[PDB]
């Protein structure tokens, strides 16, 4: 489970394990595929 620098982590830039990269609101079905840096 990778850990990176979340940009507005509640307060401000923390280092969250669930740091969000590659948001993809590119489909149609109300769906987004996301990558956390965390590996659940």
């Amino acid at each position: 489970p990778y850990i990176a620098d979340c940009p507005n982590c509640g307060h401000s830039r923390c280092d969250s394990p669930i740091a969000i990269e590659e948001v993809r609101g590119d489909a149609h079905a109300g769906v987004i595929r996301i990558q956390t840096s965390a590996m659940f």
Partner: protein, 53 residues
């Protein structure tokens, strides 16, 4: 949503993470809904799977 905002709850702490990303959901069709209905015609949308294999 203008943004995307993610987070679990470990139990002692909220411990979330949030980000900017322009999001929309046009359904495929000449109708510009904001949301998928219960009924209507089926037609070839783009979409991600449930699965892992």
């Amino acid at each position: 949503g203008d943004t995307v905002t993610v987070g679990f709850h470990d139990g002692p702490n909220r411990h979330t993470c949030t980000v900017a990303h322009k999001v929309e959901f046009r359904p495929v069709g000449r109708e510009k809904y904001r949301h998928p209905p219960e009924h209507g015609v089926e037609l070839p949308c783009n979409r991600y799977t449930h699965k892992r294999a």
